[PDB]
Structure formats: structure tokens, C-alpha cells
Design an enzyme around this catalytic site. Structure first.
Site, PDB file in Angstrom:
ATOM      1  N   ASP A   7      -8.389  -6.684  -0.290  1.00  0.00           N
ATOM      2  CA  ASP A   7      -7.735  -6.753   0.624  1.00  0.00           C
ATOM      3  C   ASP A   7      -8.710  -6.161   1.889  1.00  0.00           C
ATOM      4  OD1 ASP A   7      -7.262  -3.633   0.006  1.00  0.00           O
ATOM      5  OD2 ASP A   7      -6.352  -3.975   2.284  1.00  0.00           O
ATOM      6  N   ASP A  49       0.891  -1.162   0.075  1.00  0.00           N
ATOM      7  CA  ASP A  49      -0.047  -0.092   0.128  1.00  0.00           C
ATOM      8  C   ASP A  49       0.979   1.266  -0.038  1.00  0.00           C
ATOM      9  OD1 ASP A  49      -1.684   1.821   2.536  1.00  0.00           O
ATOM     10  OD2 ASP A  49      -2.727   1.031   0.911  1.00  0.00           O
ATOM     11  N   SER A  50       0.439   2.264  -0.157  1.00  0.00           N
ATOM     12  CA  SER A  50       1.400   3.445  -0.350  1.00  0.00           C
ATOM     13  C   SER A  50       1.348   4.323   0.850  1.00  0.00           C
ATOM     14  CB  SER A  50       0.557   4.602  -1.293  1.00  0.00           C
ATOM     15  OG  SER A  50      -0.635   5.181  -0.676  1.00  0.00           O
ATOM     16  N   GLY A  51       0.611   3.570   1.853  1.00  0.00           N
ATOM     17  CA  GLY A  51       0.840   4.363   3.370  1.00  0.00           C
ATOM     18  C   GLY A  51      -0.213   5.634   3.493  1.00  0.00           C
ATOM     19  N   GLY A  52      -0.849   6.093   2.429  1.00  0.00           N
ATOM     20  CA  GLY A  52      -1.877   7.241   2.129  1.00  0.00           C
ATOM     21  C   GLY A  52      -2.824   7.054   3.506  1.00  0.00           C
ATOM     22  N   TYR A  53      -3.757   5.782   3.196  1.00  0.00           N
ATOM     23  CA  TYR A  53      -4.759   5.943   3.862  1.00  0.00           C
ATOM     24  C   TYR A  53      -4.575   6.006   5.468  1.00  0.00           C
ATOM     25  CZ  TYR A  53      -9.462   3.854   5.478  1.00  0.00           C
ATOM     26  OH  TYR A  53     -10.675   3.702   6.024  1.00  0.00           O
ATOM     27  N   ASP A  90      -2.221   8.463  -3.056  1.00  0.00           N
ATOM     28  CA  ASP A  90      -3.710   9.012  -3.450  1.00  0.00           C
ATOM     29  C   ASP A  90      -3.984   9.689  -2.317  1.00  0.00           C
ATOM     30  OD1 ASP A  90      -4.584   6.700  -1.994  1.00  0.00           O
ATOM     31  OD2 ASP A  90      -6.093   6.327  -3.401  1.00  0.00           O
ATOM     32  N   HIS A 112      -8.027 -19.969  10.692  1.00  0.00           N
ATOM     33  CA  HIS A 112      -9.206 -20.449   9.883  1.00  0.00           C
ATOM     34  C   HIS A 112      -9.897 -19.358   9.084  1.00  0.00           C
ATOM     35  CE1 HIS A 112     -13.052 -21.827   9.496  1.00  0.00           C
ATOM     36  NE2 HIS A 112     -13.568 -20.622   9.920  1.00  0.00           N
ATOM     37  N   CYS A 118      -9.837 -26.749  11.251  1.00  0.00           N
ATOM     38  CA  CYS A 118     -11.026 -27.323  11.370  1.00  0.00           C
ATOM     39  C   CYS A 118     -10.796 -29.129  11.323  1.00  0.00           C
ATOM     40  CB  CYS A 118     -11.963 -27.182  10.155  1.00  0.00           C
ATOM     41  SG  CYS A 118     -12.596 -25.322  10.548  1.00  0.00           S
ATOM     42  N   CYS A 137      -9.429 -26.175   6.264  1.00  0.00           N
ATOM     43  CA  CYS A 137      -8.249 -25.907   6.966  1.00  0.00           C
ATOM     44  C   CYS A 137      -7.686 -26.791   8.367  1.00  0.00           C
ATOM     45  CB  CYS A 137      -8.546 -24.502   7.598  1.00  0.00           C
ATOM     46  SG  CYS A 137      -8.962 -24.334   9.245  1.00  0.00           S
ATOM     47  N   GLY A 170     -11.885   5.114  -2.565  1.00  0.00           N
ATOM     48  CA  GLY A 170     -12.967   5.798  -1.966  1.00  0.00           C
ATOM     49  C   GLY A 170     -14.138   5.169  -1.727  1.00  0.00           C
ATOM     50  N   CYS A 192     -15.063 -26.876   6.025  1.00  0.00           N
ATOM     51  CA  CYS A 192     -13.755 -26.099   5.921  1.00  0.00           C
ATOM     52  C   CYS A 192     -12.859 -27.287   5.924  1.00  0.00           C
ATOM     53  CB  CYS A 192     -13.657 -24.887   7.176  1.00  0.00           C
ATOM     54  SG  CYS A 192     -12.022 -24.143   6.988  1.00  0.00           S
ATOM     55  N   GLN A 245     -10.622   7.721  -8.108  1.00  0.00           N
ATOM     56  CA  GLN A 245     -11.309   8.396  -6.934  1.00  0.00           C
ATOM     57  C   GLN A 245     -12.841   9.223  -7.631  1.00  0.00           C
ATOM     58  OE1 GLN A 245     -10.658   8.022  -3.958  1.00  0.00           O
ATOM     59  NE2 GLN A 245      -8.887   7.109  -3.653  1.00  0.00           N
TER      60      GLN A 245
END
Ligand SMILES: O=c1[nH]cnc2c(CCNCC3CCCCC3)c3[nH]c(NCCN4CCOCC4)nc3cc12
Ligand SMILES: O=c1[nH]cnc2c(CCNCC3CCCCC3)c3[nH]c(NCCN4CCOCC4)nc3cc12
Ligand SMILES: [Zn+2]
Ligand SMILES: [Zn+2]
Lengths: 357, 357
Positions: free
Chosen positions: B255, B92-96, B131, B324, B298, B295, B205, B293, B178
Site C-alpha cells: 500500500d 490499517d490499525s490507526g497506529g502509524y 503495533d 491514471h 490515456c 486507462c 518498520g 497505458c 518489527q
């Protein structure tokens, strides 16, 4: 396999190496038993604990009788099923962590009879008699009073164990020697326990503030009082050098929270002594925690990475430190076993101490 | 493999399934990317994250630029080496997470140029343009101002990426659309990004308070504005039903922290809806978290056990819930991919929702 059989394959001085066979598996001795919670070890899956070389784990009775409850765990199929650990489990009696005391037991009621029943409900393979760890220091009079009570509790534990068919047929029972630091009381306590008869014998009442010199002094006279042909368990020990000196004095089994608790706090064991991975000196150190260690953590991650994880409070830092420290402890035990087997344990003890310190 | 190649193997309506090939591996789409810390996922080793089916993870740039620092991580060989994850990483860009703002960037300085450099230093395979996630609700004027700035930042990101040979040759760059909820601004933003040219296009956005109906309404007109032949990434989404509806609208990548964060808090995803494992109703429930499941959790442990671990605050409870939930999310993505591949994604979406709700 049998219910319980202890075989000594090699000796060096008072040190011994061998095997305990039980229905759920074989235990190589001298053995270190990692301690848990409802987890086999905090922050580890049972398969990881096995992968580190553990043959047996220590079940935290006090924790488990409190929550989820022994009866609940029994209802759910027993502690082995609950946890997902199918190998032997030694359960503590819950005595030490609970310490109003009376001849009946402790109220906080936990009596010898209740303790043995709870260990049955968890499905223990090695059951500990319910005792009192005498505080240190103790006057000769208090040590004697306390030891005497513990021997009466040991008989009550034996009979409670024996009165339960399923438990007597499938599990083992260990008695615990008391007497503080006094030779005569340790002898009285050994004599009382051997008269009752147990499958193994613990040395209780040590690692309670007396320090290594005194603990070793007391082990020097106390372990030869126990039956030679049964395993000897030193409760609550300890640091790597404590373990080596105790094996030199005839101890076959150990438990301690140090590798697990130390680990989560940032202390890693190495053959050159413990390190505190949070220290700035490790922030760009690409070496593994220990240069010789065979564990998965030392194969895959650097000091620098683990330094960051612990400083950041990440759960993965706890997981990785714990796996390395329990693996280190199992490698120590393997080196002790092989060295006794080869007749070079004395040299190993001296080489170990020269490097570690 | 190539630096970047996206191939669409099958379609159903606006839904698509395919692969992104990169130097470090192949990414099956639609893809869910687990989010991390310095851990690939909190409380999981990288091999566990892989075992759950993840092809790519989301690198937490904000966390890592703060500590240990991007330059330090570069010095140590890059984030793949540091973490022990050798497959693609989208940073990620670190923006958020950082959101004084100016045309230069944000001070809190993080500019488009610094963001692209930090992602280079971590060794990112998919780099996000820097952004601003416009807050919701936004007036048309603020949405337009913010989008315009973001498109100027997107050009600055492209040129910073391109000016660095190693990065331009080995990584990919995604632009982010955006425009808040406004069709005309979303179109202007898509047009601006396609003029610049990126390897994939995110829808930014959204998932910022507008709710599912509005988010789906905006996706309905917004995704067809992006180039069809490139992947479409919906940032920060989401719950299982959000993911299914977004794939119905042409989204290829997702994500979110929900499976990991939810997990540590006691929420387990199941095909019958989420459950809160701390609830008393699970205290003696011997069933696995989910009946279908695949996994490892489980296969091996009960609801009852995990209930106890979470109530007791054990790290192992966090580990098992997290494994899980990330496995459940990968099984959801596999069911989406197979159903689109077989032409039955519409039926899958309806069957899924009928059972889940
Ligand atoms: O004299 C002793 N009798 C019984 N227990 C002792 C203990 C407890 C050993 N380990 C207990 C472990 C169970 C699971 C949870 C963590 C604790 C001792 N520990 C120490 N030193 C430390 N001295 C002990 C003596 C006795
Ligand atoms: O418009 C958006 N631009 C950029 N990022 C957005 C994000 C962040 C998505 N995931 C970030 C993740 C990185 C590692 C650590 C955890 C966070 C958004 N997230 C949401 N909803 C939640 N909406 C977003 C919009 C943007
Ligand atoms: Zn190691
Ligand atoms: Zn599962």
C-alpha cells in the site's frame, strides 16, 4: 444536420418546446446549459455531463482566453477536442466577466472583432455577440447610451462572424437585447437586432440585482419583442423557480453557475427545495439527496455520506454534489418540456412551486 | 468463497503469484491496494477504482475514527455500504498516523483492543494488529524494546479479534513484524508472530528513512523468516522500483499514498519514468500521459489538457491524474503477476528498470 434549425413542436401560452438542430447535435428546448472552465463542468468528466442529460454546454471564453489561450487551444484542435466534448458548445463573448471602456471595446483589449475571433478559435457552435451588460439600476440616459453602443457592437459582431467563411458556414450567431428595465429601450434594442438579423436572440441585462418580480415584469414585455421563430436565451438565469417563470414568459435557453457553484458549497437541489447537506440533521440520514431523482448519485450514496465528504473537504463530495445538481436541473428541464408538450405546463408550474416552497 | 484462503499458483525465485480468496472477493497477488479517506481513493468513485483493476482497497482507519466515527459508520451499515465498495477492504490499525505511549496503548486512547473494535465497526475484511512502527534509526536496545511491546500488542490483537464471533468468522487478521534493521530482532519477531498465528504477515518498520538499499537488505533476511504459505505485506511501499524489488524478495501485497498524492501534485507515472505534467514542455503535447497505458484517461485526454487543468487548480485535473496513476500501478502489478506466471519475472525486472531509469 443543418448549420442551424429551430423547430417549435408544441406551445402553451407563451411557453414553447422544440429542438435546435446543429451539425454537432440536437438541443432540446427549453434547455439548461451547464457552465464550465477548461472542464465541461467543474469536477465532472464530459461523459458524466452528458449522462445527466445536457445537450449543449456553455464554454467559459474569459477563463480560456486567459489560459491556456484561444490560439493555443486552436493549435491543439479546438475546445471540443481539448475537452473531449463532441456536442454543441455555446461560447460566451467574455464581456460580462471582463466587466477602460471605449467605442472600440474594453481594455482590461477585447473588441467585438477579437471576441468573435476568439470564439472561432475555440471552435464555438453558438457564438454570442459582444455586448455590455448595463449595470442595475441605470438611469434612462445611461441605459440608452449603453444599449445603443451594444447595438453598434452587435452589427460589428455580425460582420466579423460573416467575414469568416468557416465560422459563418458551421456556427450560429446570437444577438443580445439590452435596455435595462425600460420598455421603450427594449423595443429599440429588439428592432435593431432583428434589422441586423441573428440566429437566436438573448435577453441580456437581467439577473443583475433587480430581483425576480422586476425581472419577470421586464420579461413580460421584452420577450414578445423578439422574433417568435427564433430561440430566446435568458443569460445568467437561474434558480429553478426563475427558470419556470421565464419559460412561462417565452424563454427557451438558460445558463447559470448556481447548480455547480451551489453544489461545491454544500447546497443540493431537491423537489422540496434546496438543502444544505453540511447541516447536522443529515449526519445519519440514509436517504438519497432527493427521493425522486434518477441520477447516479441518488442511486448509490446517502445524504449521510455526502454530508461527511463535504464537511471533510473531499473532492469526491464536490463531484457527487455537482453531478446531482446538474442532473436535477436537466430533470427540471425535461419536466418542463414534457408538460408543455402535453398541454399541462401551467399545472406543472403551480405544482412545482407549491412543493418546492 | 471461504473466510480466507491464500493459494500460490507460480513462483520464480523468492517471487510468488497467486490469489487470496475471501467472502467479498478474490485478490490477485502480488497486489497493490489503493489508499483512501471516506473516498475509496481521493477524487475517484468506487467504480473507477475497480475499473483500474484494484481488487482490494486500504481503509484509512485513523481518518474515519476521527470523523465520521467508527460507531457512526457502523450505525449506517458499515464502511462498504457507506463508501459504495463491495469488495474486500484492508483496514490499517490507526497506529502509524497516531504516532503519550504506554503498555496499554497510545493516548493522543488507542489500544490494541480499541483498534480491533474500530476495525470491526468499520466492517473490515483484513484487520491489522495494532503495533508500533519503530522510528529509524533506532539503537538495538530501543528496537528490541519496541518490538517486544509490539509482539505483546499482537497477542492482545489476536485475542480481541478472536473474542468477537462475527469478526473471527468473516474477517482475517494480519500480524506485523518489527525489529528495525536487526536480523536477530526480526527473527525473534517472526517467531513470536508465528507462535501466535495470523492469516498473513506484514513487514513493518521499513520505508521510514532507511532508503532502498537498506530496505532491500533487511527484506533479504526478513521475508524468509515469515511463513511461506501465508501472504507477505510490505507496509507503506512504494515507488514502482521499490515494488518490483520487494516482489523479487517475496512480498505479495503493498500500500502507499504515492500514486494518489503524487497525482494530485502533478506527477504522472510512465514506463519511461515519472513526469511532472505542470512542466512547460507539456503545454502543447498531444500525446497521452503514457504511450502504452490502457486507462480511460490515456484513451481520451492529452498531456496538454491535463497540464492546463493542474496548472489551473481544477478538480478534474486531480481526478484524471489520480485515475491514471492508480491504473498505472495496477498495470505494473499485472505485468509482475503475468511475468512470474510465465517464468520471466527476472527479465521483466531488468527490462523495467532499464526503461524506467
Ligand atoms: O447582458 C448580458 N450580456 C452577456 N452576458 C450576460 C451574463 C453572463 C451569462 N453567463 C456567463 C457565464 C459564462 C461562463 C462562465 C460563467 C459565466 C449575465 N449573467 C447574469 N446574471 C448572473 N446576467 C447577465 C447578463 C449578461
Ligand atoms: O511498521 C508499520 N506498522 C504499521 N503501519 C506502517 C505504515 C503504514 C502503512 N500505510 C498506512 C496508510 C493507511 C491509510 C492512510 C494512509 C497511510 C508504514 N508506512 C511506511 N512508510 C510510508 N512505513 C510503515 C510502517 C508501518
Ligand atoms: Zn440525484
Ligand atoms: Zn493512463
Amino acid at each position: 444536420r443543418p448549420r442551424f434549425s429551430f423547430s417549435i413542436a408544441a406551445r402553451e401560452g407563451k411557453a414553447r418546446t422544440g429542438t435546435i438542430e446543429m451539425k454537432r447535435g440536437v438541443i432540446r428546448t427549453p434547455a439548461f446549459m451547464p457552465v464550465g472552465t477548461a472542464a465541461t463542468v467543474k469536477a465532472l468528466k464530459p461523459e458524466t455531463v452528458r449522462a445527466t442529460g445536457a445537450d449543449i454546454i456553455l464554454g467559459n471564453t474569459y477563463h480560456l482566453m486567459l489560459r491556456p489561450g484561444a490560439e493555443r487551444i486552436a493549435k491543439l484542435g479546438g475546445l471540443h477536442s481539448f475537452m473531449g466534448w463532441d456536442r454543441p458548445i455555446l461560447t460566451d463573448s467574455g464581456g460580462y466577466q471582463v466587466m477602460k471602456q471605449s467605442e472600440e471595446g474594453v481594455t482590461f483589449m477585447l473588441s467585438p472583432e477579437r471576441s468573435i475571433e476568439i470564439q472561432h478559435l475555440l471552435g464555438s457552435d453558438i457564438v454570442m455577440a459582444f455586448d455590455e451588460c448595463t449595470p442595475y439600476p441605470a438611469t434612462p440616459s445611461r441605459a440608452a447610451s449603453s444599449m445603443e453602443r451594444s447595438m453598434r457592437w452587435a452589427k460589428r459582431s455580425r460582420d466579423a462572424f460573416d467575414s469568416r467563411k468557416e465560422q459563418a458556414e458551421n456556427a450560429a450567431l446570437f444577438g443580445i437585447q439590452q435596455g435595462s428595465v425600460f420598455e421603450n429601450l427594449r423595443q429599440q434594442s429588439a428592432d435593431a437586432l432583428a434589422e441586423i438579423g441573428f440566429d437566436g436572440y438573448a435577453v441580456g441585462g437581467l439577473a443583475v440585482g433587480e430581483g425576480q418580480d422586476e425581472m419577470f415584469r421586464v420579461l413580460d414585455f421584452s420577450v414578445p419583442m423578439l422574433p417568435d421563430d427564433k430561440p430566446h436565451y435568458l443569460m445568467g438565469v437561474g434558480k429553478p423557480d426563475d427558470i419556470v417563470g421565464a419559460v412561462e414568459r417565452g424563454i427557451d435557453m438558460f445558463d447559470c453557475v448556481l447548480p455547480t457553484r451551489s453544489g461545491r458549497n454544500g447546497q443540493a437541489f431537491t423537489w422540496d427545495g434546496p438543502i444544505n447537506i453540511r447541516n447536522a440533521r443529515f449526519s445519519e440520514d440514509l436517504k438519497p439527496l432527493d427521493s425522486e431523482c434518477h441520477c447516479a448519485v441518488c442511486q448509490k450514496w446517502s445524504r449521510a455520506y455526502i454530508h461527511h465528504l463535504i464537511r471533510a473537504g473531499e473532492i469526491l463530495g464536490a463531484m457527487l454534489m455537482t453531478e446531482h445538481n446538474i442532473a436535477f436541473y436537466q430533470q427540471l428541464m425535461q419536466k418542463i418540456r414534457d408538460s408543455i408538450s402535453e398541454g399541462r405546463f401551467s399545472q406543472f408550474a403551480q405544482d412545482f412551486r407549491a412543493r418546492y416552497f
